[PDB]
Amino acid sequence: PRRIPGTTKVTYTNKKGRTFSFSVPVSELTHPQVTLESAAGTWREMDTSFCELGDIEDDMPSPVDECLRGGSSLDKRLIQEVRERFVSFCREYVLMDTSGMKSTILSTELNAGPDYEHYDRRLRRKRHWLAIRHRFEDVRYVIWPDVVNPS
Amino acid sequence: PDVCVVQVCDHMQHDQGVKRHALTITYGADGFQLRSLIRRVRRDLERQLSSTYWQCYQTNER
């Protein structure tokens, strides 16, 4: 914690021309001026890219999505992390408990997805398979690079 | 500024016949360090206040 100095010196010139220092007691602010409705644009926002919702226009957020967001892919343990996350993703897709999940064509879900109550029973496995496909198109050259020491 | 008016107002209701306090400290101008003031209030009340739960935090610049 840094303490406020309290006093400041400002330069004042008289009518003759002599300059000296007014000592002004000043204190700094501590709280942001957020009560005004004007938006400056300089505030740290909250990340919500990892959340899974019922947005059918998006993909299901996998952990591999945070591993391909602009890192150094030539690092070896990052390749191992990508590999084990894709293995866990495919294994949790294969060993998924499909007891209550049913996929019948319902007419009322035409201009939307399945409803919010039937997300886990209708939308979950299809979004999981589409996420597996869309990650396989991004990862298959990292785990299995083309033949020209390996990672 | 050269003058400063402060207000210490707590609203005392009756929660099952027992008093509960909702206390607000309000300054008159900006610059006065409330973040350093609250930790002085917070250190004093950790030994002297017997209740279930209590908070102390800064809501505005004043």
Binding site: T7, K15, F20, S21, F22, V24, P25 | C4
Partner: peptide, 18 residues
Amino acid sequence: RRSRRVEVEPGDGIALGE
């Protein structure tokens, strides 16, 4: 009431003399 500083202040500017 704010105590007077031991240095000069802008509040003493009218006492500076024009």
